[PDB]
From Swiss-Prot, chains A, B, C, D:
The keyword Magnesium does not apply. Belongs to the lambda phage major capsid protein family. It comes from Escherichia phage lambda. This is Major capsid protein. The keyword Cell membrane does not apply.
Length: 340, 340, 340, 340
């Protein structure tokens, strides 16, 4: 009658493997931990890596109370939906209209439709951490019954650049200026080589407005076959523009909803210099769930559940749990440039 | 014996799956509701979406008499045709000549011919809503015994662009001007990236007249195999021209007829910037039909009926009922440019 | 004894399924009527097409005495040959000479040779109607004891174009001029999109002579595998040149024999813009025939017969009867250009 | 004893399948006549077929006395070879001494080589008529006791062009002149389309010399299976390099000998614009052999014979009889111009 955590994990395989842009490109390692806290010493490498977690008071990061730690408990994300068979279901190919009126068949379809919405809600929380770690080397962590704190990965000052004092590309003459030298100087602050630049819509329009960029950029398709197939199913909000020399140009127009407001993952005039082989870690803390522990599921990135509430009245619901801790092993691998 | 709703839904699957261009590309999600009202709050992914429905008096939209809502009862389309045995059947290949004389074999094909003409009549209504929603973020909804109203889903003023005052492509130099800058500038108003542009015939003739487009457009077959597969059976009115950079170029020449007057879906000199992964919703209100309810068919996008009329038992008719409400989850995913 | 109509229909099925070019590509629907008269209102989707029939006197069309009609009785084509065992038989592969001495074997073989030639005579009449319907939107109908009339399908004047006043491709610079812009301008007159162009030999050589065409035309085999399959067995008079972007280029050098004189289907310097998904109808009036009525064959496109002339000194013959009426549902789907 | 007609046919099973190229490509219809005269009226599809026969004396054609005829007696050829002598054998590898002891095997091998040589010699007479039919539209045939005459099939003069002035490919500048426009202009004189051109080592080397030919040719095998099947049957080989757009480029290495001269099939290559679906007829006047009429062989393309005469031991011989008359239904389907 109730889907077990193992049954839901096997059904959500396709939706879980679908990763947003920044997670898919720069976070290619996953480390579920059997303990509630995440111990960075147990990850291969990263012997001296620490996380300076600072508590947030009054919406302002209070760094004086913060301290460096290699052990941390991530906040718990618990998207849940009540199971109502009378709710609308997305029509699937070759569905039987008479089955779609069976309340038992609609309950089966509602649970998996809820598993889709709950999965991408957790994937949004992971991508918010993913893009903020690349943009700033730090992000704000929230969670259920969790006081929001800032997780800092220790990015150098030189890796966060803002164009000012005449270096604004908007004030440069688009006809005769070549942004190559500026990008070369930005890329030197990166720990490794830079072979990809992720723009926002506005920053890309400014970047491509230069005549030297139009003449140099290879817009033809197949310029980077490895990257084009990695971003193929992300065409809704990701655009591969081409190769700018040995650097691949990508535009990220993704959005996330937070407190009922649509926000952009990338602020206006954003230019992120990075490496496709950068090391990002998807570490997950263990969520002690009685149903999961009884099924032998100790460490997992997702804890799907299909159960009823104990209180009266008994209402069936679905839920997926996760304790994500998206981290960059080397935050200086990226050079985040705020264009102006 | 009269054909039931479940049987006709089974035979119409081949014709019903044939979707017109805009419905097929941008409206890839169907949501039939179990109630007469369509509730936007139970559609996955929508966070407090509302429409503005204004009454239309004498062909004029009166927005002062309109109001916002998240629930709406769509107008019912009911294409009905009397089963006329005098209709000449299309001779099928390898068709047995003894079957041609059987009146039961003929009435089956005559009903299927009615089901075909009735399905494309509803598909024209849905495609009209779909095309007008992509062009203006709103459309006029009709229906059987239904006063016309304007269903507005809200498009920003910046996503509707008209070339004038020196920016019209017809007055540009076809040998030196590069429309690439205009497309990139127009694409900034989209919520996500742009990977497809749908032209009308005249807008395509103007766009490809530029020599910079002839040198850049990749017209080779297989340049965008996924899009070519989707528009393959639409060769009568849809033409895939190729890849213009990272953006595919499609020409839509579909047209409907009213009182013998041929009318195109897309106006003259129309350029629609959009995304192949854009989220359009095919919502349907439940049509409470006694025959459908008895067969356990509650929610459906089509309600085919084969019944006899009440005035004269000698008259037998067929009918397909539907309550379409084509909506765009984000009308700003598209940028409708009126070329000049 | 005498071969029945059903036996003759089964033997001639392969020869009947073999269609000339314009019938095979543009007239993919057949509608045999059980009544001697063809009723346009009984055909699905012919609300927007009207027939204007004018009489012909001294080979000159008189439109002033012509009028519209929704009902039509086509002329009767009745190719007949007498069966004489003196005819020389085509030596088939693996044929047995012991059968050649059998009088019944030679009788069957000669009847089949007559059925082949008689089918070609009717297929020529249909292709004549098909070619002229595509070229002009009208054709001249003949028949036994049938006064010739012009069947006009009401093509717009904009869809018949003649190059004149500097527009002639022959007066253009073959080294620098691009005929693409002219073709795109011509295609704007079509109801839908244009994905096929049918040239005559002379008009193709003029279109081939431009250097911009030699660089743009993809002549590789397999460029349009579905169209190459359709014209594979027509290699005598049909040549597939390749894909001109998204438009297939076909050359038609077919000839029809009228009054013992071979005549080309297409006039010199002919360029026909069209669509492979265009709706062409092969309507056939009923022919009351005793041998066809014996098998319950009321409506048919062919009426084969093997009978002996009663009242005359022992004359055995064969005959196939037909009342063809080829129609274009929308003659504006084609743009017929008379090059110069 | 003497070998049955079926016994030599089982030996000439695969040997009669092999056929010279021009007969294999353009003469797929065999019409063996039961009368000594051939009657072109008794062949289906021939629209008033006539042959202009002219008597030839002292090596010159007198067309003043000739007249168009529909009937014609083909000259009969009967190559014969004596059987069962002690003549020096033919060298064939992988032959053991076990077959040197049986005198019947050597006699058996003598019949096969004679049947092959006689079947070849008649096949050469037909190819002389065939090659000359598509090259000149007229030919002179020989006979056992026949009076030589010219057989003119009415080839149009326009299909027999002669290069003069600047049309010579040697006078034209190499790599500055495209042979396409010549081949397309010469093809306008053909009745249908041209999908094959025949070459030879001398003229194909001139055609492959142009740089523009190298890129447009498809050297990969599998382009035309029927064409590659003909190149494989010949051990000494007769090859074609591949497709040339829609036209096939074939090279013929076969040669013949007429009387005492070793005149070639065609000088250099000229231009052989042909169609693989062109209609050519293999018309055979019947040869009256008493043993053939006794076996029921009234009309046949080949009259094979294995009989014995007189002597002690009696003289044995083999003979294949045929009265071939190779004709082109439409000689204007080919264009032959003198090329240098």
């Amino acid at each position: 009658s109730m889907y077990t955590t193992a049954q839901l994990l096997a059904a959500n395989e396709q939706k879980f493997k679908f990763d947003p842009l920044f997670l898919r490109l720069f976070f290619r390692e996953s480390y579920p931990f059997t303990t509630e806290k995440v111990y960075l010493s147990q990850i291969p490498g990263l012997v001296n890596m620490a996380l300076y977690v600072s508590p947030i008071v009054s919406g302002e990061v209070i760094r004086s109370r913060g301290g460096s730690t290699s052990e941390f408990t991530p906040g718990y994300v618990k998207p849940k939906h009540e199971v109502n068979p009378q709710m609308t279901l997305r029509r699937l190919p070759d569905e039987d209209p008479q089955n779609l009126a069976d309340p038992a068949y609609r309950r089966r379809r509602i649970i998996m439709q809820n598993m889709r919405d709950e999965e991408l809600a957790i994937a949004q929380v992971e991508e918010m951490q993913a893009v903020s770690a690349v943009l700033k080397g730090k992000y704000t962590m929230t969670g259920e019954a969790f006081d929001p704190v800032e997780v800092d990965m220790g990015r150098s000052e030189e890796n966060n650049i803002t164009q000012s004092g005449g270096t604004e590309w908007s004030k440069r003459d688009k006809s005769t200026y070549d942004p190559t030298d500026d990008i070369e100087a930005y890329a030197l602050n990166a720990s490794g080589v830079v072979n990809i630049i992720v723009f926002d819509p506005k920053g890309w329009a400014l970047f491509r407005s230069f005549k030297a960029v139009k003449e140099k950029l290879d817009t033809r398709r197949g310029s980077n076959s490895e990257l084009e197939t990695a971003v193929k199913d992300l065409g809704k909000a990701v655009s591969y523009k081409g190769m700018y020399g040995d650097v691949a140009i990508v535009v990220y127009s993704g959005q996330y909803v937070e407190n009922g407001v649509k926000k952009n993952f990338l602020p206006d005039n954003t230019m992120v210099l990075g490496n496709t082989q950068a090391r990002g870690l998807r570490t997950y803390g263990c969520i002690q769930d009685a149903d999961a522990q009884r099924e032998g599921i100790n460490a997992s990135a997702r804890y799907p559940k299909n159960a009823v509430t104990t209180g009266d009245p008994a209402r069936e619901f679905t839920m997926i749990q996760s304790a994500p801790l998206m981290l960059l092993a080397d935050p200086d691998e990226f050079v985040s440039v705020q264009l102006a």
